[PDB]
């Protein structure tokens, strides 16, 4: 891994990196959150911010130094602080941001800054192609309510990488994390829907653990089964 300031960057694939920021919270110590950086021709795409604006500014600083390509857009995967805490750094830099319309509607209640554009989804969970233009390899899929009602997921076309955000925990997790905003009744089906939407993704990236195999999907579903 490459440490840059207080953030960590790990190359996952020729054009894909995972960014990691930490937030020190009393009683738990530093808590990592993961997002994605994707190079696509002559532009860069970002999945999720860091915990804060200052940390999210360091993501763009690392991009300028290590990739040196303009950041075309960013997608944030729900209105929990580890995913949208740094929206201002993106907007300050002039970067177009996209989120589930539900996430932008929930944002002020969550103390988050809403994205500048809203994504809507068909009944099968796939993004309406009109609302996700020029996304390149970013394939956005809404699995259904799980970790939150608005949580979305992103597969990376041309790779074996799919990003489950906070919906998916790794195979060695012993809880489903924060269920304060969770839909305990549809969580398991939402997790399996993510698995079905990207059936051939072998590397599963998630918010709060190192990249896992597809076991993380199945494991997460079966811990969510015990909540019904």
Ligand X SMILES: C[C@@H]1[C@H]([C@H](C(=O)O)[C@@H](C)O)N=C(C(=O)O)[C@H]1S[C@@H]1CN[C@H](C(=O)N(C)C)C1
Decide: residue 16, CB within 10 A, 0-12 exposed, 13-18 middle, 19+ buried.
buried
- Work out whether 61 is an interface residue with ligand X (CB under 6 A): no
Q: Which is nearer to Zn ion, 83 or 192 (CB)?
A: 83
- Work out whether 170 is an interface residue with ligand X (CB under 6 A): no
What are the DSSP calls for 160-203, one per residue?
TEEEEETS---TT-SS----TT--TTTHHHHHHHHHHHSTT--E
Q: Which of residues 119-158 bind ligand X (CB under 6 A)?
A: 147
- Work out whether 212 is an interface residue with ligand X (CB under 6 A): no
Q: Residue 222 contacts by C-beta under 8 Å, 6 or more apart in sequence?
A: 188
Which entry of Zn ion, ligand X, none binds 81, CB below 5 to 8 A by partner kind? ligand X
The nearest distance, CB 150 to Zn ion, in angstroms, is 9
Q: Is 80 annotated as a binding residue?
A: yes
Q: Is 82 annotated as a binding residue?
A: yes
- Work out whether 216 is an interface residue with Zn ion (CB under 5 A): no
The nearest distance, CB 11 to ligand X, in angstroms, is 21
Q: Which is nearer to ligand X, 15 or 153 (CB)?
A: 153
Q: Is 166 annotated as a binding residue?
A: yes
The rounded distance, in Å, linking the Cα atoms of 207 and 49 is 11
Quick one: which of 2, 5, 31, 225 contacts ligand X (CB under 6 A)?
31
User: Do 65 and 76 meet the contact criterion of CB atoms below 8 Å apart?
Assistant: no
Name which of 188, 186, 178, 175 is nearest 217 in CA terms.
188
Tokens 């694939």, residue located: 13
Phi and psi, residue 79, nearest 5°: -95, 60
Which entry of Zn ion, ligand X, none binds 32, CB below 5 to 8 A by partner kind? ligand X
Q: Which is nearer to ligand X, 177 or 211 (CB)?
A: 177
- Tokens standing for residue 66: 């290590």
Q: Which of residues 63-122 bind Zn ion (CB under 5 A)?
A: 80, 82
Residues annotated within a binding site: 78, 80, 82, 147, 166, 208
């Amino acid at each position: 891994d490459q440490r840059f300031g207080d953030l960590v960057f790990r190359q996952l694939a020729p054009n894909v990196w995972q960014h990691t920021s930490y937030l020190d919270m009393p009683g738990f110590g530093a808590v990592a959150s993961n997002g994605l950086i994707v190079r696509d021709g002559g532009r860069v795409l970002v999945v999720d911010t860091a915990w804060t604006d200052d940390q999210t500014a360091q993501i763009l600083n690392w991009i300028k130094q290590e990739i040196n390509l303009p950041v075309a857009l960013a997608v944030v995967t729900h209105a929990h602080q580890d995913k949208m805490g740094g929206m201002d750094a993106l907007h300050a830099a002039g970067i177009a941001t996209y989120a589930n319309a539900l996430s932008n509607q929930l944002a002020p209640q969550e103390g988050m800054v809403a994205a500048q554009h809203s994504l809507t989804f068909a009944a099968n969970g796939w993004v309406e192609p009109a609302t996700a233009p020029n996304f390149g390899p970013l394939k956005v899929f809404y699995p259904g309510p799980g970790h939150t009602s608005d949580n979305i997921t992103v597969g990376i076309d041309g790779t074996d990488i799919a990003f489950g955000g906070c919906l998916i925990k790794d195979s060695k997790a012993k809880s489903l994390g924060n269920l304060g905003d969770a839909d305990t009744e549809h969580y398991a089906a939402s997790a399996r829907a993510f698995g079905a939407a990207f059936p051939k993704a072998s590397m599963i990236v998630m918010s709060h653990s190192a990249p896992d195999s597809r076991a993380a999907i199945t494991h997460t579903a079966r811990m969510a089964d015990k909540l019904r």
